[PDB]
């Protein structure tokens, strides 16, 4: 039984033959054709289960890699013991430990290598890069960050970023000292120094917010003071540092400088850095502008990561809700998903592979495609009767028929307003519109309280001859309404003896008195307290004797 299924057609009679009233609603041109773009519960469950399976497989791979590196470290130490071993073995072991995040074991190996003087500039760069934990970053990207590079950078900080940042700074200082032993400018300006600085910035990118904020204003300025010539990688890393913190005013200006003075040196990564910054700063219009600039350039050769960043930005903008005045109707930001097929076509033209996108993003991409990517062959048939009526049947089965042109018949009407300018003239309607009824509502202050829980209202139809009036009228009964003679229609109980008393002393009829032997009344307690409070002010004055003290001596009297 459903309360929405009502009688669309009138009871058969001779009016249907002797009157010109149409027997069907005229077609609504603005209401679009009903098409199928939903997901069933089992399909969603299967998608979630498969994502969990792939994520646990990636976690298992990370675990076996950690076990392998730990076993190698232990067996290497035990086997070597007193016997000397080549420095490169310990160097690669430390690199692997750092890449897997085992900085605790990585530090002593690097310290002893530096004391042995077997580490060079390239090896220092390797160690500093390994401190960033690329393997842990990949694992967390697949498992926790949901393949979101921004979330990877945001979550790698919590993996003891500050301690690793301090260790990286110490390694950079000792690397500079070990590089100085290779006239007043050689240690400062050289390729190795710039490479080491780039490595330091790269490993600081994965630390906490404090270090990523300190990169562009402390590390860059210190490099400038030392006099180390920066590189395109340095500019990329400082751009990424500025973008992760949402400060795009400077991230745009630095790229402008790169395009002006150091053109034909900008690589792809600048565009994804700007895209990431705009996505973090909720500047999707500027993100779209940068994507269009990239697709017009075509030389930076937009990466799968760049395409994924732009798609994620547009989908986040699609899911962002608007304010209430724009939310009175259906949400308007869902239109942003219509741009996805355009982006996919542009990726086909640019040669960016479609499969390189993360599967988490691909699920939502396929959702938006099934919502806004109908082909011409299926467009030739989606307009029929069977499909629309099947959609109607599905809506009826799910009990949602409030937004269907065919199955909804409206009965409520709104009358005119009597203008006080000239009330003599009467007004007649000249058209009819299906206004959604929140345009002209009763203002709240002349409405019963919330009108929903206190009162239950049902809009039914009179069975008597209307002869003109509201054929469909609503009844408004209170939720707590009961029959006026409910007392004798319900079985008699213990409370019948309290008939008519305004404030009965329920404690006398109470049941707890007999079960508890230490009974005491809060009413008696407060009565005693009030009596004591009255006694406080019921003290009274006292007749006080006075003795003259005009003279020098204070007169003293006895009893």
């Amino acid at each position: 039984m459903l309360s929405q299924n009502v009688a669309k057609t009138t009871v058969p009679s001779y009016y249907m033959i002797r009157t010109n009233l149409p027997h069907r609603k005229p077609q609504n041109q603005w209401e679009g054709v009903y098409y199928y773009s939903g997901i069933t519960k089992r399909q969603r469950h299967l998608i979630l289960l498969h994502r969990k399976r792939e994520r646990e497989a990636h976690m298992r791979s990370f675990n076996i890699s950690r076990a392998s590196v730990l076993q190698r470290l232990e067996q290497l130490s035990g086997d070597r013991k007193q016997e000397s071993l080549p420095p490169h073995v310990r160097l690669d072991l430390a690199v692997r430990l750092a890449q897997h995040g085992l900085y605790q074991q990585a530090t002593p190996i690097v310290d002893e290598l530096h004391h042995q003087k077997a580490l060079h500039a390239g090896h220092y760069a390797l160690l500093i890069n390994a401190l960033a934990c690329p393997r842990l970053g990949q694992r967390i990207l697949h498992c926790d960050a949901q393949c979101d590079p921004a979330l990877t950078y945001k979550l790698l900080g919590d993996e003891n970023g500050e301690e690793r940042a301090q260790e990286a700074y110490r390694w950079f200082d000792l690397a500079l000292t070990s590089l100085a032993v290779d006239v007043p400018y050689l240690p400062q300006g050289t390729a190795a120094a710039s490479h080491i600085t780039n490595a330091l910035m790269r490993t600081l990118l994965t630390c906490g917010y404090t270090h990523v904020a300190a990169i562009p204003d402390s590390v860059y300025d210190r490099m400038g003071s030392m006099g180390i010539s920066p590189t395109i990688s340095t500019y990329e890393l400082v751009m990424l540092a500025l973008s992760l913190q949402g400060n795009m005013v400077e991230a745009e200006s630095i790229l402008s400088f790169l395009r002006s003075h150091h053109s034909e040196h900008i690589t792809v990564e600048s565009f994804n850095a700007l895209l990431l910054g705009h996505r973090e700063a909720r500047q999707f219009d500027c993100c779209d502008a940068i994507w269009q600039e990239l697709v017009d350039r075509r030389w930076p050769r937009a990466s799968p990561l760049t395409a994924e960043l732009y798609l994620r930005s547009i989908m986040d903008h699609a899911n962002t809700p608007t304010s209430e005045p724009l939310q009175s109707f259906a949400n308007i930001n869902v239109v942003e998903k219509k741009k996805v097929p355009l982006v996919l076509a542009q990726m086909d033209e640019l040669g960016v592979p479609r499969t390189h996108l993360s599967r988490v993003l691909m699920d939502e991409v396929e959702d938006s495609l099934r919502k806004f990517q109908t082909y011409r062959s299926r467009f030739y048939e989606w307009g029929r009767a069977v499909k629309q009526f099947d959609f109607i049947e599905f809506r009826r089965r799910n009990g949602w028929l409030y937004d269907l042109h065919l199955m909804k018949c409206t009965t409520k009407q709104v009358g005119p307003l009597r203008d006080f300018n000239d009330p003599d003239a009467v007004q007649g309607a000249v058209a009819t519109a299906e206004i959604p009824a929140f345009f002209n509502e009763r203002p709240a202050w002349e409405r019963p309280p919330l009108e929903e829980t206190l009162y239950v209202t049902t809009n039914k139809e009179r069975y008597d001859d209307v002869r003109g009036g509201d054929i469909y009228y609503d009844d408004t009964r209170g939720l707590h309404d009961r029959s006026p003679t409910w007392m004798n229609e319900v079985p008699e109980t213990r409370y019948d003896r309290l008939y008519g008393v305004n404030h009965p002393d329920i404690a006398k009829i109470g049941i707890r008195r007999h079960l508890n032997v230490e009974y005491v009344n809060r009413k008696e307690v407060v009565e005693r307290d009030a009596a004591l409070m009255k006694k406080t002010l019921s003290s009274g004055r006292r007749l006080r004797h006075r003795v003259e003290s005009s003279r020098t001596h204070r007169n003293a009297g006895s009893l």
Partner: protein, 154 residues
Amino acid sequence: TERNTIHYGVPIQQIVDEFVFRHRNARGERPLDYFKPFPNFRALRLNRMYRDVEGFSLMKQRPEFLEWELFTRYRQHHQQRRRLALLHGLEPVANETAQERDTRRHRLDEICERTPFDEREMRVNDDEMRVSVETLRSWFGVYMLPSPTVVNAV
């Protein structure tokens, strides 16, 4: 993180329409030129104060007499100065320096001193009175509208 919910503010056009509808055409706030036979769009919108009045301190907050006409003459003088700069190729550049702007202003002042004023381009707004340059000089003094002889003497 407060930008997750996008809040499109009410447009300025919507605000102006609501204000004028509430005020029933806002006859007081509309200019006097609006009530003329064929007003152009410039004299159609509202009476917001623009940046033309900046720099003129003769009238602090209420021009008592002829100060508005003097200000109109001054702003038309500056309009003609701008026109002369445009003709002679002394337009401001986006990235001028101090030693550029001062010299450019000096050259423009040379041109302005050597170029006569054009009285035909003067126009009268709503409720304004036409006053001759001779009348303005006699009232406020010749230094307000100096002859080139007065300029070089100063």
